[PDB]
RNA sequence: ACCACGAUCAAAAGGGACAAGCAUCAAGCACGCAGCAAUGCAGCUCAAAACGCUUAGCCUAGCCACACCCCCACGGGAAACAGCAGU
RNA sequence: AAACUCCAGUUGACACAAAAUAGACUACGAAAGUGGCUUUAACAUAUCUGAACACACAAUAGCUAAGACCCAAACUGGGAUUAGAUACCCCACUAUGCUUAGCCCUAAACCUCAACAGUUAAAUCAACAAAACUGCUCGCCAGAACACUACGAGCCACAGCUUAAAACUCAAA
């Protein structure tokens, strides 16, 4: 069999890797922004739980951790 | 482990083995053999201790004992060879095979299943109902949901006393 | 007619059954049980699809739902043809 | 041509590198892999099937930290070729290949042929390839391209991996 199907995928992958390399500083700023909104969306979900259960503040001694940071 | 002076399983029932020279007793003991000879002695001790017929090796009881001795030898090997991935696989597979054996023994002969668990020191466990990753988001939310439940239970009890106290004042 | 310890018809309540698409909705977060109570136990649902989003009146001798909107209608917004004819 | 010229040849001393011949053998291991020597430990299961995600593994490249360094060698530099030569050819040298401790989780990871049980008779069978079938089970597929992509989610991964669409387009592929 010829490799024409492979060649189409080969060029797709080459152009994608080159695009990512050319815009890696913009994508890094976008990724940072998404992880922040992701952390906020997670904090809202936990706050919805204790508010709907009748509590006015988080359980005593609870601190929502940052589960999406590199550290 | 059996004492090093223990005779091999093959020379333990030969007539007159107690009257030979001390040198001959060393050459026929576990001290002068490989670890596999010591495991055959361990297996024999468990059989007489547990199974009803120590000569039947094809019963589900003898197989669980034989495999339990292999499992212990793999654990001892890995205590020294912690990067030996091949034997780590053999250990985990053997533990799975023993659990399947114990499941089949528990279903068919419970009285024998209890003696095996006691004799070998096995704590039987039932498998989990679901197999799914407990990632960070889930682990965190589950811990928060348990705290919220614990706090709501305290507030519901403090709403019983106040209602009870006010009710007594009317009298 | 009236009682019918009855029949017929048929609510509320209890049990069971009951649409489609998406799993890139995979966990739900109190959803259980015991006890006369006090209270105790920590359980309950879920890849055999819970929880969720989206679409749609349906299984048509007909049935369900709605009746300007706020699911409801004390109250409020407000002043009502989704009755017929008509604009 | 550049390069070296404390260079070259013989002789002696001399590895944290790599393992002629055997091998015309076809073995071991779940796969990846495994072919110098010795020893220790050691290669699951007395029905089968059973997972992108559970559990444990997984060539090469790559990341983090500390070491070793013969040789090889991305990159880079020099020489040459050429219309040009960011290549192919020559030289030098680095990351890297090694060890230790952690990661990363990919392959034409393909013998592109799922596991188990059974058959060689019937219709033997599109073509080619490695003859054609039966039972049973799990996984997967439903025009091409968009797409090993976007978004969401998970992940020690932050130019990553896994899962993975749609719109616009064509009447073919
Ligand atoms: N999800 C479960 O943990 C679970 C529980 C009981 C039975 N099963 C059986 O597993 C099979 C696969 O189910 P699916 O199509 O929903 O899975 P899937 O492949 O869509 O995976 C969904 C989830 O189930 C897990 N899973 C996948 N294969 C599994 C298997 N063989 N056994 C157990 N867990 C598995 C995955 O890790 C993931 O967490 C079915 O035969 C189902 O009956 C699965
Ligand atoms: K209404
Ligand atoms: K060799
Ligand atoms: K692959
Ligand atoms: K191949
Ligand atoms: Mg060809
Ligand atoms: Mg393309
Ligand atoms: Mg009713
Ligand atoms: Mg699934
Ligand atoms: Mg999406
Ligand atoms: Mg539903
Ligand atoms: Mg509608
Ligand atoms: Mg109107
Ligand atoms: Mg109304
Ligand atoms: Mg009208
Ligand atoms: Mg050879
Ligand atoms: Mg199996
Ligand atoms: Mg699956
Ligand atoms: Mg994979
Ligand atoms: Mg690897
Ligand atoms: Mg490396
Ligand atoms: Mg060199
Ligand atoms: Mg180097
Ligand atoms: Mg070496
Ligand atoms: Mg290979
Ligand atoms: Mg299979
Ligand atoms: Mg297609
Ligand atoms: Mg790829
Ligand atoms: Mg991707
Ligand atoms: Mg993404």
Coordinates of C-alpha atoms (C1' of nucleotides) and ligand atoms in Angstrom, one line a residue:
Chain A
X1 CA 0.0 0.0 0.0
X2 CA 1.1 3.6 -0.7
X3 CA 1.6 6.0 2.2
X4 CA -0.6 8.8 0.9
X5 CA -2.9 8.7 4.0
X6 CA 0.2 8.8 6.2
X7 CA 1.5 11.8 4.2
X8 CA -1.7 13.8 4.8
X9 CA -1.4 13.2 8.5
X10 CA 2.4 13.9 8.4
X11 CA 1.8 17.4 7.0
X12 CA -1.1 18.1 9.4
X13 CA 1.1 17.2 12.4
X14 CA 4.1 19.2 11.1
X15 CA 2.0 22.4 10.6
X16 CA 0.3 22.0 14.0
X17 CA 3.6 21.7 15.8
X18 CA 4.9 24.7 13.9
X19 CA 1.8 26.7 14.8
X20 CA 2.1 25.8 18.5
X21 CA 5.8 26.8 18.4
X22 CA 5.0 30.1 16.8
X23 CA 2.3 31.1 19.3
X24 CA 3.6 29.4 22.5
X25 CA 3.7 32.7 24.4
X26 CA 0.1 33.6 23.5
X27 CA -1.1 30.1 24.4
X28 CA 0.7 30.2 27.7
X29 CA -1.2 33.4 28.6
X30 CA -4.4 31.7 27.5
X31 CA -3.7 28.6 29.5
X32 CA -3.1 30.6 32.6
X33 CA -6.4 32.4 32.2
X34 CA -8.3 29.2 31.8
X35 CA -6.8 27.6 35.0
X36 CA -7.9 30.6 37.0
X37 CA -11.5 30.4 35.8
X38 CA -11.3 26.7 36.4
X39 CA -10.2 27.3 40.0
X40 CA -13.0 29.9 40.4
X41 CA -15.6 27.5 39.0
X42 CA -14.5 24.9 41.5
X43 CA -14.7 27.2 44.4
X44 CA -18.3 28.2 43.4
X45 CA -19.3 24.5 43.3
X46 CA -18.1 23.9 46.9
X47 CA -19.8 27.1 48.1
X48 CA -23.0 26.1 46.4
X49 CA -22.9 22.9 48.6
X50 CA -22.7 24.5 52.0
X51 CA -25.1 27.3 51.1
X52 CA -27.8 24.9 49.9
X53 CA -27.4 22.8 53.0
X54 CA -28.3 25.8 55.3
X55 CA -24.8 26.9 56.3
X56 CA -23.9 30.6 56.0
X57 CA -20.1 30.2 55.9
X58 CA -17.7 27.3 55.0
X59 CA -17.4 24.6 57.6
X60 CA -15.1 25.6 60.5
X61 CA -11.5 25.3 59.5
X62 CA -12.1 24.6 55.8
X63 CA -10.0 26.2 53.1
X64 CA -10.5 25.3 49.5
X65 CA -7.1 24.3 48.1
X66 CA -5.7 25.3 44.7
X67 CA -6.0 22.0 42.8
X68 CA -4.9 23.3 39.4
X69 CA -1.6 25.1 40.1
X70 CA 1.7 23.7 39.0
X71 CA 3.0 23.6 42.6
Chain B
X1 CA 11.0 -19.8 59.0
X2 CA 11.9 -23.3 59.9
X3 CA 15.2 -23.7 61.8
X4 CA 18.2 -24.2 59.5
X5 CA 18.8 -27.6 61.2
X6 CA 15.5 -28.9 59.8
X7 CA 16.0 -31.9 57.5
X8 CA 14.8 -31.7 53.8
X9 CA 11.3 -33.0 53.1
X10 CA 12.8 -36.0 51.3
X11 CA 15.1 -37.2 54.0
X12 CA 12.8 -36.6 57.0
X13 CA 11.2 -40.1 56.8
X14 CA 14.2 -42.3 56.0
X15 CA 14.9 -44.9 58.7
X16 CA 17.9 -44.1 60.9
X17 CA 18.3 -40.5 59.9
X18 CA 18.7 -39.6 63.6
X19 CA 21.8 -41.7 64.1
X20 CA 24.0 -40.5 61.2
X21 CA 27.0 -38.3 61.7
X22 CA 26.5 -34.6 62.4
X23 CA 28.2 -33.7 59.1
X24 CA 25.6 -35.9 57.3
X25 CA 22.8 -34.1 59.1
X26 CA 24.1 -30.7 57.9
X27 CA 24.3 -31.9 54.3
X28 CA 20.6 -33.0 54.5
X29 CA 19.3 -29.8 56.3
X30 CA 17.9 -26.6 55.1
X31 CA 21.2 -24.8 55.8
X32 CA 22.8 -26.5 52.8
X33 CA 19.9 -26.1 50.4
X34 CA 18.4 -23.3 48.4
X35 CA 15.4 -21.3 49.5
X36 CA 13.0 -23.5 47.5
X37 CA 13.6 -26.4 49.8
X38 CA 12.7 -24.2 52.8
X39 CA 9.4 -23.3 51.1
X40 CA 8.5 -27.0 50.7
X41 CA 8.9 -27.3 54.5
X42 CA 6.7 -24.3 55.2
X43 CA 4.0 -25.7 52.8
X44 CA 4.0 -29.0 54.7
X45 CA 3.6 -27.3 58.1
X46 CA 0.5 -25.3 56.9
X47 CA -1.1 -28.4 55.4
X48 CA -1.0 -30.5 58.6
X49 CA -2.2 -27.4 60.5
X50 CA -5.2 -26.6 58.2
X51 CA -6.4 -29.2 55.7
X52 CA -8.1 -32.4 56.8
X53 CA -6.2 -34.6 54.4
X54 CA -2.6 -33.3 54.2
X55 CA -2.0 -35.7 51.3
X56 CA -4.6 -34.3 48.9
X57 CA -2.8 -31.6 46.9
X58 CA -5.5 -30.9 44.3
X59 CA -8.1 -29.6 46.7
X60 CA -9.0 -25.9 46.8
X61 CA -7.5 -25.7 50.3
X62 CA -4.1 -27.1 49.3
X63 CA -3.9 -24.8 46.3
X64 CA -4.6 -21.7 48.5
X65 CA -1.8 -22.8 50.9
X66 CA 0.7 -23.6 48.1
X67 CA 0.0 -20.2 46.5
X68 CA 0.2 -18.4 49.8
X69 CA 3.7 -19.8 50.2
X70 CA 4.6 -18.5 46.8
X71 CA 3.2 -15.1 47.7
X72 CA 5.3 -14.8 50.8
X73 CA 8.4 -15.7 48.8
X74 CA 7.7 -13.0 46.2
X75 CA 7.2 -10.4 49.0
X76 CA 10.6 -11.4 50.5
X77 CA 12.2 -11.1 47.1
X78 CA 10.7 -7.7 46.4
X79 CA 11.9 -6.5 49.9
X80 CA 15.4 -6.7 48.4
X81 CA 14.6 -6.2 44.7
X82 CA 12.3 -3.2 44.7
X83 CA 12.8 -2.3 41.0
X84 CA 12.2 -5.9 39.8
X85 CA 9.0 -5.2 37.8
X86 CA 8.7 -8.8 36.6
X87 CA 8.4 -10.3 40.1
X88 CA 6.2 -7.4 41.2
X89 CA 3.8 -8.5 38.5
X90 CA 4.0 -12.1 39.7
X91 CA 3.1 -11.0 43.2
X92 CA 0.1 -9.0 42.2
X93 CA -1.2 -11.7 39.9
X94 CA -0.7 -14.4 42.6
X95 CA -2.7 -12.2 45.1
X96 CA -5.5 -11.9 42.6
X97 CA -5.5 -15.7 42.0
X98 CA -5.7 -16.4 45.7
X99 CA -8.6 -14.0 46.1
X100 CA -10.4 -15.8 43.3
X101 CA -9.7 -19.1 45.1
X102 CA -10.9 -17.7 48.4
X103 CA -14.1 -16.4 46.7
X104 CA -14.8 -19.9 45.4
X105 CA -14.0 -21.6 48.7
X106 CA -16.2 -19.1 50.6
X107 CA -19.1 -20.0 48.3
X108 CA -18.7 -23.8 48.5
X109 CA -17.3 -24.7 51.9
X110 CA -17.6 -21.9 54.5
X111 CA -16.3 -24.0 57.4
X112 CA -13.1 -24.7 55.5
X113 CA -12.9 -21.1 54.3
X114 CA -12.8 -19.9 58.0
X115 CA -10.1 -22.3 58.9
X116 CA -8.0 -21.2 55.9
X117 CA -8.3 -17.5 56.8
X118 CA -7.3 -18.3 60.4
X119 CA -4.5 -20.7 59.5
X120 CA -2.9 -18.4 56.9
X121 CA -3.8 -15.1 58.6
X122 CA -5.7 -13.9 55.5
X123 CA -8.2 -11.0 56.0
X124 CA -10.8 -11.5 53.3
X125 CA -12.1 -8.4 51.6
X126 CA -15.0 -7.8 49.2
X127 CA -14.1 -6.0 46.0
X128 CA -15.2 -2.4 45.3
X129 CA -18.5 -1.9 43.5
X130 CA -17.1 0.7 41.1
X131 CA -13.7 1.3 39.5
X132 CA -13.1 5.0 38.7
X133 CA -10.3 7.4 39.4
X134 CA -10.6 9.6 42.5
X135 CA -9.0 12.7 41.1
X136 CA -8.2 15.9 43.0
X137 CA -11.5 17.6 42.3
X138 CA -13.5 14.6 43.5
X139 CA -11.4 13.9 46.6
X140 CA -11.6 17.6 47.6
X141 CA -15.4 17.9 47.0
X142 CA -16.1 14.6 48.8
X143 CA -14.1 15.9 51.9
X144 CA -16.1 19.2 51.8
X145 CA -19.4 17.4 51.5
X146 CA -18.6 15.3 54.6
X147 CA -17.7 18.4 56.6
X148 CA -20.9 20.1 55.5
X149 CA -22.9 17.0 56.7
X150 CA -21.1 17.0 60.0
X151 CA -21.8 20.6 60.6
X152 CA -25.5 20.3 59.6
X153 CA -25.9 17.5 62.1
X154 CA -24.5 19.7 64.9
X155 CA -26.9 22.5 64.0
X156 CA -29.9 20.1 63.9
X157 CA -29.1 19.0 67.5
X158 CA -28.8 22.6 68.7
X159 CA -32.3 23.2 67.2
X160 CA -33.7 20.4 69.4
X161 CA -32.5 21.8 72.7
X162 CA -33.7 25.4 72.1
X163 CA -37.1 24.0 71.0
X164 CA -37.1 21.7 74.1
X165 CA -36.1 24.6 76.4
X166 CA -38.8 27.0 75.2
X167 CA -41.4 24.2 75.4
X168 CA -40.6 23.7 79.1
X169 CA -40.9 27.4 79.9
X170 CA -44.6 27.4 78.8
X171 CA -45.3 24.9 81.6
Chain C
rA1 C1' -85.5 8.4 45.9
rC2 C1' -84.2 7.4 51.4
rC3 C1' -80.4 3.1 54.3
rA4 C1' -77.7 0.4 50.7
rC5 C1' -72.3 -2.7 55.5
rG6 C1' -73.7 -3.8 48.3
rA7 C1' -72.7 -2.5 43.3
rU8 C1' -71.1 1.3 40.0
rC9 C1' -67.8 5.3 39.3
rA10 C1' -63.4 7.6 40.9
rA11 C1' -59.8 11.4 44.0
rA12 C1' -56.0 11.8 47.8
rA13 C1' -52.4 8.3 49.8
rG14 C1' -49.1 3.5 49.3
rG15 C1' -46.6 -0.2 45.8
rG16 C1' -45.2 -1.2 40.6
rA17 C1' -44.6 0.3 35.5
rC18 C1' -43.8 4.3 31.9
rA19 C1' -40.3 9.3 25.7
rA20 C1' -35.9 10.7 22.8
rG21 C1' -30.6 12.6 22.2
rC22 C1' -25.8 13.6 24.8
rA23 C1' -21.1 9.9 29.2
rU24 C1' -17.0 15.7 26.2
rC25 C1' -23.3 15.4 32.1
rA26 C1' -19.3 10.3 36.1
rA27 C1' -19.9 10.7 40.2
rG28 C1' -24.7 12.6 43.4
rC29 C1' -23.9 15.4 48.3
rA30 C1' -27.8 13.4 53.0
rC31 C1' -29.6 11.4 48.7
rG32 C1' -30.2 5.5 54.5
rC33 C1' -31.5 2.1 58.4
rA34 C1' -32.9 0.8 63.5
rG35 C1' -36.0 2.5 67.9
rC36 C1' -42.5 3.5 71.5
rA37 C1' -39.4 7.5 72.5
rA38 C1' -34.8 9.4 73.9
rU39 C1' -31.4 8.5 70.6
rG40 C1' -28.1 5.1 68.0
rC41 C1' -25.7 3.2 63.6
rA42 C1' -23.4 5.5 58.7
rG43 C1' -25.5 4.5 55.5
rC44 C1' -28.4 5.5 50.5
rU45 C1' -28.1 6.1 44.5
rC46 C1' -24.7 5.2 40.4
rA47 C1' -21.3 2.7 33.7
rA48 C1' -27.4 -2.9 34.1
rA49 C1' -26.1 5.0 33.4
rA50 C1' -27.4 7.8 39.3
rC51 C1' -26.8 13.2 39.0
rG52 C1' -27.3 16.6 34.9
rC53 C1' -28.2 19.3 30.0
rU54 C1' -31.1 19.5 25.6
rU55 C1' -35.6 18.1 22.5
rA56 C1' -40.7 16.8 22.5
rG57 C1' -47.7 17.0 24.2
rC58 C1' -48.8 11.3 24.4
rC59 C1' -49.3 4.8 24.0
rU60 C1' -55.3 8.8 19.7
rA61 C1' -63.0 5.1 20.7
rG62 C1' -59.1 8.9 23.4
rC63 C1' -55.6 10.7 27.2
rC64 C1' -52.3 14.3 29.7
rA65 C1' -51.2 19.3 30.6
rC66 C1' -52.3 24.4 30.6
rA67 C1' -56.2 28.4 30.9
rC68 C1' -52.2 36.5 30.4
rC69 C1' -47.4 36.2 33.5
rC70 C1' -44.7 35.1 38.6
rC71 C1' -44.4 26.2 38.4
rC72 C1' -48.9 27.7 42.6
rA73 C1' -51.9 32.7 43.2
rC74 C1' -52.9 35.0 49.9
rG75 C1' -50.3 38.7 47.3
rG76 C1' -47.9 41.1 43.0
rG77 C1' -47.1 42.6 37.8
rA78 C1' -51.1 44.2 35.5
rA79 C1' -56.2 44.4 33.0
rA80 C1' -55.9 39.1 29.6
rC81 C1' -60.7 35.7 22.6
rA82 C1' -55.3 29.1 23.6
rG83 C1' -65.0 30.0 23.4
rC84 C1' -67.5 31.6 18.3
rA85 C1' -67.2 35.2 14.4
rG86 C1' -63.7 38.9 13.4
rU87 C1' -59.1 42.3 13.4
Chain D
rA1 C1' 40.0 21.7 1.5
rA2 C1' 39.7 22.5 6.5
rA3 C1' 41.7 20.1 10.9
rC4 C1' 46.1 18.1 14.0
rU5 C1' 51.4 18.3 14.0
rC6 C1' 53.2 17.4 22.9
rC7 C1' 51.6 14.1 15.6
rA8 C1' 52.4 9.0 13.8
rG9 C1' 54.4 3.6 14.2
rU10 C1' 56.2 -0.6 17.4
rU11 C1' 56.2 -2.1 22.7
rG12 C1' 54.4 -2.0 27.8
rA13 C1' 50.8 -0.4 31.6
rC14 C1' 45.7 0.7 31.3
rA15 C1' 37.3 1.4 31.7
rC16 C1' 31.0 3.8 35.8
rA17 C1' 32.0 2.3 27.5
rA18 C1' 30.3 -1.8 24.3
rA19 C1' 29.4 -7.3 24.5
rA20 C1' 33.4 -11.0 17.4
rU21 C1' 32.7 -16.3 16.5
rA22 C1' 28.8 -19.8 18.6
rG23 C1' 23.6 -18.3 15.9
rA24 C1' 22.8 -22.5 9.2
rC25 C1' 20.4 -22.3 16.6
rU26 C1' 14.8 -20.3 17.2
rA27 C1' 15.0 -20.3 22.9
rC28 C1' 13.1 -17.0 27.2
rG29 C1' 9.5 -13.2 28.8
rA30 C1' 2.7 -10.5 29.5
rA31 C1' 4.3 -7.1 26.1
rA32 C1' 8.2 -3.7 25.7
rG33 C1' 12.3 -6.5 25.4
rU34 C1' 16.3 -10.5 26.2
rG35 C1' 22.4 -13.6 22.7
rG36 C1' 30.3 -11.9 27.5
rC37 C1' 31.2 -14.8 32.6
rU38 C1' 29.8 -16.3 37.9
rU39 C1' 26.6 -16.8 41.9
rU40 C1' 21.9 -15.6 44.8
rA41 C1' 16.7 -14.9 44.2
rA42 C1' 13.3 -16.2 40.4
rC43 C1' 9.5 -16.8 35.8
rA44 C1' 1.0 -16.2 38.7
rU45 C1' -3.4 -19.5 38.1
rA46 C1' -6.3 -27.5 38.0
rU47 C1' -12.4 -24.0 33.3
rC48 C1' -12.4 -20.0 29.8
rU49 C1' -13.6 -14.8 28.6
rG50 C1' -13.2 -10.2 31.3
rA51 C1' -11.0 -2.5 31.4
rA52 C1' -8.3 4.2 27.0
rC53 C1' -9.9 5.4 32.6
rA54 C1' -9.2 0.4 38.1
rC55 C1' -4.2 -2.2 39.2
rA56 C1' 0.8 -3.0 37.5
rC57 C1' 4.0 -2.5 33.3
rA58 C1' 5.6 -0.3 28.7
rA59 C1' 11.5 0.6 22.9
rU60 C1' 13.7 5.2 21.5
rA61 C1' 13.5 10.3 22.3
rG62 C1' 12.7 13.7 26.4
rC63 C1' 12.5 16.3 31.6
rU64 C1' 14.7 17.0 37.0
rA65 C1' 19.1 16.1 40.3
rA66 C1' 24.0 14.1 41.2
rG67 C1' 28.1 11.3 38.9
rA68 C1' 31.1 8.8 34.9
rC69 C1' 33.1 9.8 29.8
rC70 C1' 36.4 5.5 25.4
rC71 C1' 33.5 6.0 21.3
rA72 C1' 29.3 7.8 18.8
rA73 C1' 26.5 12.2 18.1
rA74 C1' 20.9 16.3 17.3
rC75 C1' 22.5 21.4 17.7
rU76 C1' 26.5 24.7 16.7
rG77 C1' 31.2 26.1 14.3
rG78 C1' 34.7 25.3 10.3
rG79 C1' 35.8 23.0 5.0
rA80 C1' 33.7 21.8 0.4
rU81 C1' 29.7 21.4 -3.3
rU82 C1' 25.7 24.6 -5.6
rA83 C1' 22.1 29.4 -9.2
rG84 C1' 21.2 28.9 -3.8
rA85 C1' 22.6 24.3 0.0
rU86 C1' 19.8 26.7 6.6
rA87 C1' 21.1 19.6 3.2
rC88 C1' 23.5 15.3 1.1
rC89 C1' 30.2 14.8 1.6
rC90 C1' 34.8 16.1 5.3
rC91 C1' 36.5 17.9 10.3
rA92 C1' 35.6 19.5 15.4
rC93 C1' 32.7 19.5 19.6
rU94 C1' 28.0 19.7 22.9
rA95 C1' 22.9 18.0 24.7
rU96 C1' 22.2 12.9 24.5
rG97 C1' 23.4 7.4 24.5
rC98 C1' 25.9 5.0 30.6
rU99 C1' 25.2 4.9 36.4
rU100 C1' 22.0 6.5 40.6
rA101 C1' 17.1 8.6 42.2
rG102 C1' 12.6 10.4 40.4
rC103 C1' 9.4 11.7 36.2
rC104 C1' 7.4 11.5 31.2
rC105 C1' 3.6 7.2 29.2
rU106 C1' 4.6 7.7 23.1
rA107 C1' 6.0 4.1 18.2
rA108 C1' 4.8 1.3 11.2
rA109 C1' 4.5 -0.4 20.4
rC110 C1' 2.7 -4.1 13.0
rC111 C1' 3.9 -10.9 12.8
rU112 C1' -1.1 -4.0 10.7
rC113 C1' -4.0 -10.8 11.5
rA114 C1' -8.1 -10.2 19.6
rA115 C1' -8.6 -14.4 23.7
rC116 C1' -10.3 -19.5 24.3
rA117 C1' -12.2 -24.1 22.0
rG118 C1' -12.6 -27.0 17.5
rU119 C1' -12.4 -28.6 12.0
rU120 C1' -9.9 -29.9 7.0
rA121 C1' -15.8 -31.9 4.7
rA122 C1' -18.9 -29.4 2.3
rA123 C1' -19.9 -24.0 -1.6
rU124 C1' -12.2 -24.1 -1.4
rC125 C1' -11.9 -18.9 -2.3
rA126 C1' -13.8 -11.1 -5.0
rA127 C1' -8.1 -9.4 -5.5
rC128 C1' -3.5 -9.4 -3.1
rA129 C1' -1.4 -11.1 1.3
rA130 C1' 0.3 -15.7 5.3
rA131 C1' -5.5 -21.7 2.6
rA132 C1' -10.8 -21.9 4.1
rC133 C1' -14.0 -22.2 8.2
rU134 C1' -17.1 -23.3 13.1
rG135 C1' -18.5 -22.3 18.4
rC136 C1' -18.0 -18.5 22.3
rU137 C1' -16.6 -13.9 24.5
rC138 C1' -14.7 -9.1 25.0
rG139 C1' -12.9 -4.7 22.3
rC140 C1' -13.8 -1.8 18.0
rC141 C1' -16.0 0.2 13.0
rA142 C1' -20.4 2.7 9.8
rG143 C1' -18.4 8.2 2.8
rA144 C1' -14.2 11.5 2.3
rA145 C1' -11.9 15.7 4.4
rC146 C1' -12.0 19.0 8.5
rA147 C1' -9.1 15.9 12.7
rC148 C1' -3.0 12.4 16.2
rU149 C1' -7.7 19.3 15.5
rA150 C1' -11.3 22.8 18.9
rC151 C1' -13.7 22.7 23.5
rG152 C1' -14.5 20.1 28.2
rA153 C1' -12.2 16.7 31.8
rG154 C1' -8.0 14.0 33.9
rC155 C1' -2.8 13.7 34.4
rC156 C1' 4.4 15.0 38.7
rA157 C1' 2.9 15.9 32.1
rC158 C1' 2.9 23.5 31.1
rA159 C1' 5.4 24.1 23.0
rG160 C1' 2.9 17.6 26.7
rC161 C1' -0.2 13.0 26.9
rU162 C1' -5.2 10.5 27.0
rU163 C1' -10.3 10.9 25.6
rA164 C1' -12.3 13.6 21.2
rA165 C1' -16.6 16.8 18.2
rA166 C1' -19.0 20.3 15.0
rA167 C1' -19.7 24.1 11.2
rC168 C1' -18.3 25.4 6.3
rU169 C1' -16.8 21.7 1.7
rC170 C1' -17.0 17.7 -2.1
rA171 C1' -19.5 13.3 -5.1
rA172 C1' -16.3 11.1 -4.4
rA173 C1' -12.4 9.2 -1.1
Ligands
LIG1 N1 -17.7 1.3 35.9 C1 -17.5 0.3 36.7 O1 -16.7 0.4 37.6 C2 -18.2 -1.0 36.5 C3 -18.9 -1.6 37.5 C4 -19.5 -2.8 37.3 C5 -19.5 -3.4 36.1 N2 -18.8 -2.8 35.1 C6 -18.7 -3.5 33.7 O2 -17.6 -3.1 33.1 C7 -17.8 -3.1 31.6 C8 -17.4 -1.8 31.0 O3 -18.4 -0.8 31.5 P1 -18.5 0.6 30.8 O4 -18.7 0.4 29.3 O5 -19.4 1.5 31.5 O6 -17.0 1.2 31.0 P2 -16.1 2.3 30.3 O7 -15.0 1.6 29.5 O8 -16.9 3.3 29.6 O9 -15.4 3.0 31.6 C9 -16.2 3.7 32.5 C10 -15.7 3.5 33.9 O10 -15.7 2.1 34.2 C11 -14.4 1.6 34.3 N3 -14.3 0.3 33.6 C12 -14.0 0.1 32.3 N4 -14.0 -1.2 32.0 C13 -14.3 -1.8 33.2 C14 -14.4 -3.2 33.5 N5 -14.3 -4.2 32.6 N6 -14.7 -3.5 34.8 C15 -14.9 -2.5 35.7 N7 -14.8 -1.2 35.5 C16 -14.5 -0.9 34.2 C17 -13.4 2.7 33.8 O11 -12.2 2.7 34.4 C18 -14.2 4.0 34.1 O12 -14.0 4.4 35.5 C19 -19.3 -3.5 31.5 O13 -19.4 -4.9 31.1 C20 -19.9 -3.2 32.8 O14 -21.0 -4.0 33.1 C21 -18.2 -1.6 35.3
LIG2 K1 -49.0 28.0 34.3
LIG3 K1 30.8 -10.9 23.3
LIG4 K1 -0.4 3.1 19.4
LIG5 K1 5.5 -4.4 10.9
LIG6 MG1 5.9 -0.6 -3.1
LIG7 MG1 -3.8 18.9 5.9
LIG8 MG1 -54.5 8.6 42.5
LIG9 MG1 -18.0 4.4 28.4
LIG10 MG1 -16.6 19.3 24.0
LIG11 MG1 -32.4 10.7 33.5
LIG12 MG1 -42.9 22.5 23.3
LIG13 MG1 -54.3 35.6 24.8
LIG14 MG1 -51.3 30.0 36.4
LIG15 MG1 -61.1 33.0 17.5
LIG16 MG1 26.2 -13.3 14.3
LIG17 MG1 -8.5 -13.4 32.6
LIG18 MG1 -14.5 0.5 28.0
LIG19 MG1 -3.2 4.1 25.3
LIG20 MG1 9.3 4.3 28.5
LIG21 MG1 17.7 9.1 29.8
LIG22 MG1 34.4 11.8 18.9
LIG23 MG1 29.1 14.2 26.3
LIG24 MG1 27.6 -0.6 30.9
LIG25 MG1 8.6 -4.1 18.0
LIG26 MG1 -9.0 -9.8 24.8
LIG27 MG1 -15.7 9.9 8.2
LIG28 MG1 0.8 11.1 18.3
LIG29 MG1 -4.3 17.1 21.4
LIG30 MG1 -7.4 21.4 26.2

